[PDB]
Amino acid sequence: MEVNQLGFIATALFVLVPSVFLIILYVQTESQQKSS
């Protein structure tokens, strides 16, 4: 299968970068009670 080369860093980073943001913002808040 001859495909584009950035498929991984493209699709992948697309997932992990914004996702990591949300992840952060959640556990940053669920830790107001020091819980988490």
């Binding site: 299968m1 498929g7 992948a12 997932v15």
Partner: peptide, 30 residues
């Protein structure tokens, strides 16, 4: 290769179904 990328998404998503249904923030009747 790229077909794992497809299957990885496909899957981690089925699990975003797990949490969002079973460890979802509950409805508080107050």
């Amino acid at each position: 290769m790229e077909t794992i990328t497809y299957v990885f998404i496909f899957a981690c998503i089925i699990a975003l179904f797990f949490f969002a249904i079973f460890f979802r923030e509950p409805p508080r009747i107050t």
